Amino acid sequence: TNLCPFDEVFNATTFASVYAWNRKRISNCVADYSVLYNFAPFFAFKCYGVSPTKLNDLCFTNVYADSFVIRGNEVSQIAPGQTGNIADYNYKLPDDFTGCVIAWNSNKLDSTVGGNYNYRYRLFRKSKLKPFERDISTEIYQAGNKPCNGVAGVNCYFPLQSYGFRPTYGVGHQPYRVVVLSFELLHAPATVCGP
Amino acid sequence: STIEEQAKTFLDKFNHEAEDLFYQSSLASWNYNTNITEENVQNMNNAGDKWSAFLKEQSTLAQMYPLQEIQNLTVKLQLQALQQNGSSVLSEDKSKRLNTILNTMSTIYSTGKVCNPDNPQECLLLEPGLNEIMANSLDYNERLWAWESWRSEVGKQLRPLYEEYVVLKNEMARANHYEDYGDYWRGDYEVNGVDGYDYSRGQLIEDVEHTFEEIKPLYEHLHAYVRAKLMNAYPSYISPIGCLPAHLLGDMWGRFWTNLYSLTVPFGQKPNIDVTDAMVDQAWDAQRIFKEAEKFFVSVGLPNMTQGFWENSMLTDPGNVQKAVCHPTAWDLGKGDFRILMCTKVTMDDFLTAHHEMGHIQYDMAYAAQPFLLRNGANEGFHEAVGEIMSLSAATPKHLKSIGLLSPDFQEDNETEINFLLKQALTIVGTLPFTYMLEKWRWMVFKGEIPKDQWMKKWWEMKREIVGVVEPVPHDETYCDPASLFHVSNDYSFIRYYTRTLYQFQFQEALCQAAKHEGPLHKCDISNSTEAGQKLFNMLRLGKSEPWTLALENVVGAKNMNVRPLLNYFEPLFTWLKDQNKNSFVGWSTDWSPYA
Ligand SMILES: *[C@@H]1O[C@H](CO[C@@H]2O[C@@H](C)[C@@H](O)[C@@H](O)[C@@H]2O)[C@@H](O[C@@H]2O[C@H](CO)[C@@H](O)[C@H](O)[C@H]2NC(C)=O)[C@H](O)[C@H]1NC(C)=O
Ligand SMILES: *[C@@H]1O[C@H](CO)[C@@H](O[C@@H]2O[C@H](CO)[C@@H](O)[C@H](O)[C@H]2NC(C)=O)[C@H](O)[C@H]1NC(C)=O
Ligand SMILES: *[C@@H]1O[C@H](CO)[C@@H](O)[C@H](O)[C@H]1NC(C)=O
Ligand SMILES: *[C@@H]1O[C@H](CO)[C@@H](O)[C@H](O)[C@H]1NC(C)=O
Ligand SMILES: *[C@@H]1O[C@H](CO)[C@@H](O)[C@H](O)[C@H]1NC(C)=O
Ligand SMILES: *[C@@H]1O[C@H](CO)[C@@H](O)[C@H](O)[C@H]1NC(C)=O
Ligand SMILES: *[C@@H]1O[C@H](CO)[C@@H](O)[C@H](O)[C@H]1NC(C)=O
Ligand SMILES: [Zn+2]
């Protein structure tokens, strides 16, 4: 039996940034919900649409795993119907989202003295993201009426800022690795489910 | 895009950046304060320069959003903070001269030594030596020698510098669209824009005189009592109808009358309330003290301390290998980092200082959600007010009984209450006239009502008429007596102490009324009162987002400063002073001087 490889999307070395969240497909496998309760400390295991207990005896079409790390006081924005810098400009979920959100503290391997400026988020954007959309653009945000012509300067700002995690911040500024799972059902026959 | 969006975006980018730079500066300063080493000094100096450079650059980049097109009052205070010009309005030569004058005055104050008329190799400085003489000596001549020497071998060297400093600061204030430097200082209390909560810069003065008029009688009675009991230690040196000489007040400048408790004790026989022996015999340490103080704050609804507070903070002297500055301070590094640096010992004073510092920490934690520039007290007199009001309840005998100290069959007599009230009055009520006189003198000097050739004459006339203190030796126009104080040699404000002293008792009265307390106000404990915690937290969380008038109204229900709560606290002492002063003269005469 080919088990679902939920061992590389939950235990990788380096996770993606907020503005470049990775998406890995999981299909044609057998569920391993038991090992999911490893890494016992969970800051959140909120689920939507379906109950965690009944997720075992359910067959779907495709399961998507999205991974990124956000600060402590911003985990609340990973949920339907939320507004904020993370929700509007980085990651948006639909109002009818079905799945679970998993978050746990990571201030042991995602922080360093001096600052971990390898994780960055989008701060300014002209529009607001529609649900499930990425944007790896790096143009200069025009905050005025005079064109910037792709350089920095008055009323022209770089869109991406860097967190700078340090291992002495609080439980709201400390890093938190967040993995969200989405369940979709299509006209194709259901295959992704265990015994 | 209107100016509103352009200002909002600029502030939104400034407030991520400032957070990182301030954190790294605060971490460097904390590392220096824990380890006094050359490498740490280098890191502190190298990290406290990027902050200044970035602040100046953003202030220069924030002058293009005029404050008449912006209509949000939350974005108009950040721009007010960021648009201050300071000393940048001056030329390069003027700024260099001002910095040199300030540094020279600070150096002369710090490294200042007076030397004896006797053998000239052994001679002292202020700390220690010139404070031990002023605090623990009963000789009339030695105190006079110290008082005259400090103002003779230091005061001469600041007047030529203070003249140019006054001129340059007035020119800078006028260039920054003000009236003088005193108006610049008063601008902290200025509120405009919000209807019904305005406060002009000139109204602060009038409020100060209005409060001092009501404060006058209690201070006059206390002055008469201190004069009456101070004539026993100096039988032939104090006039029954005159003013108290300046070198007999228990302090170098007479700021506090605390060191007169040994000479002016109401009932000497009865001890005071001390729990040092009880703490020692119960095996108490710094951890126990801070846990009890934490339980005190938990009892009123305020939250716990952060887990990082216990691990990242130093509460005991490291020892001999490490060298640190043993000054009790509360640190708000930002981004969730709260630390307390204090060399705790097993003493009642440290027990109260722990509550004071944790009150500061709670105040800092309250407004962590506000923007960076608004993360401060509403005015310059709330942080100490909160500390003192939270410290006051800890010294009550009932709270001591609650925490298992002091025997549970203690008889709280009606004489230890008088002793405690007089001890509190010697340090709370005896400093308001001094602060008022000093601030009024500096304000009049800045405005120009006092010409340059009348500084000392006006200073001594004001001290004689307001405070009730007469100089022991005549002073000409060559001395500069006010500059001998730390807060005058180093550029600092002084009315914040008066303002905080009036604020603290208003806060205490409001919280005790909210706690359903019955009896005298000085027997009040706010423990086990959720309402008194919510009422305070409603103001603690605002920060600078709202004017100080609204913040004061949110707690005390009033609109401005008041002195009735202060005089209610000292009411039994006031009645006792009337009872004891029946056969004495209440008041002083300006004419009498010791050298007349
Ligand atoms: C603050 O209150 C605690 C808890 O007391 C309880 O809650 C009160 C509101 C009231 O309803 C009491 O009757 C309750 O017992 C006090 O702690 C108790 O103190 C008494 C002293 O008589 C002691 O016998 C109990 O064992 C204590 N309970 C504990 C430690 O859990 C505390 O003394 C109060 N602090 C004050 C009044 O300053
Ligand atoms: C701070 O100082 C700068 C100059 O150092 C001021 O900028 C000038 O202000 C005057 C005032 O009318 C204008 O005429 C100039 O056009 C401004 N720019 C320059 C380059 O001179 C600035 O206004 C000052 N800030 C405040 C709050 O007064
Ligand atoms: C996660 O990876 C680490 C690194 O080798 C390993 O020690 C640990 O056992 C892994 N945990 C799981 C649940 O796979
Ligand atoms: C002021 O700016 C803040 C910043 O978001 C905004 O929430 C608030 O609504 C603004 N005030 C008004 C009256 O619109
Ligand atoms: C504060 O800490 C104590 C002991 O750690 C705990 O019992 C209490 O529940 C905490 N308070 C809150 C509000 O969590
Ligand atoms: C502080 O102590 C010494 C210098 O006194 C220093 O070498 C050491 O690294 C410091 N300890 C810390 C930072 O924990
Ligand atoms: C204290 O109480 C006693 C007993 O009533 C009374 O005689 C005395 O005047 C009161 N005041 C003082 C200061 O002792
Ligand atoms: Zn304080």
Author numbering:
A (entry chain B): 333 to 527
B (entry chain A): 19 to 614
Q: What did the authors write?
A:
Receptor binding is a key step for SARS-CoV-2 infection. In this study, we evaluated the binding properties of BF.7, BQ.1, BQ.1.1, XBB and XBB.1.5 RBDs to human ACE2 (hACE2) and determined the cryo-EM structures of hACE2 in complex with BF.7, BQ.1, BQ.1.1, XBB and XBB.1.5 RBDs, respectively. As previously reported, the binding interface of SARS-CoV-2 RBD in complex with ACE2 was divided into two patches.
In addition, BQ.1 is another descendant of BA.5 sub-variant, which has gained K444T, N460K mutations compared to BA.5, and has evolved into BQ.1.1 and BQ.1.1.18 by gaining R346T substitution. BQ.1 (KD = 19.07 ± 4.08 nM), BQ.1.1 (KD = 14.70 ± 0.37 nM) and BF.7 (KD = 13.37 ± 0.29 nM) S proteins to hACE2 are comparable to that of BA.4/5 (KD = 14.37 ± 0.41 nM). In addition, RBD N487 also forms an H-bond with hACE2 Y83 in the BQ.1.1 RBD/hACE2, XBB RBD/hACE2 and XBB.1.5 RBD/hACE2 complex structures. In the BQ.1.1 RBD/hACE2, XBB RBD/hACE2 and XBB.1.5 RBD/hACE2 complexes, RBD N477 contacts to hACE2 S19 with an H-bond. The main chain of BQ.1.1 RBD F490 forms an H-bond with hACE2 K31 that is not observed in other four complexes. In all the five cryo-EM complex structures, hACE2 H34 possesses two structural conformations. The H-bonds and salt bridges interaction network in patch 2 of all these five cryo-EM complex structures are extremely similar.
